[PDB]
């Protein structure tokens, strides 16, 4: 058992397009509240992003609004995931 | 030893310290702190849970 919902100052993004850069996550996530940091770790199989990224808000309540409005929605021509950076896990484990 | 030095701040690291929040670069094998980056201690815990096929990179290791 657990809560029906949760919030945090940081949240996860995945399934984004192959041409997405850290500037896209800012312009895509800014209307829900002010962003303060963004991160994209490097994948060594092809020297590009792993197909996911990270973003951080000025408040935890603004992250819940970014999830409530872009979760499982199209960004660059295909669906992307949006949720807190705690409950999820990569498709590689 | 005293030859250790961070690529982004004047601080350094011990040869046996593992309680400090730090990551290793995937392209030049150099260590880094969380405070000399735009990162935060909450985002550091998820980076630790990512698969080893993905890793952090210096302010230049991401472009060159």
């Amino acid at each position: 058992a657990g809560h029906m919902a949760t919030t945090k100052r940081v949240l996860y993004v995945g399934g984004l397009a192959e041409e997405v850069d850290d500037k896209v996550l800012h312009a895509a996530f800014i209307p829900f509240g002010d962003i303060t940091d963004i991160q994209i770790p490097l994948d060594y199989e092809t020297e590009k992003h792993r197909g996911f990224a990270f973003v951080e808000f000025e408040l935890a309540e603004d992250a819940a609004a970014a999830i409530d409005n872009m979760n499982e929605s199209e960004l660059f021509g295909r669906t992307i995931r949006v949720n807190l950076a705690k409950p999820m896990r990569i498709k590689e484990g | 030893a005293k030859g250790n030095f961070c690529p982004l701040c004047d601080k350094c690291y011990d040869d046996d310290d593992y309680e400090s929040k730090m990551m290793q670069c995937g392209k030049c094998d150099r260590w880094v702190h969380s405070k000399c980056e735009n990162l935060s201690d909450e985002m550091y815990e998820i980076l630790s849970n990512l698969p080893e096929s993905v890793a952090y990179t210096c302010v230049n290791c991401t472009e060159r």
């Binding site: - | 730090m22 990551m23 630790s48």
Partner: peptide, 13 residues
């Protein structure tokens, strides 16, 4: 990623 919080062959346990 490679860190001081973890460096095992896998994140499982």
């Amino acid at each position: 990623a490679r860190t001081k919080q973890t460096a095992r062959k896998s994140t499982g346990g």
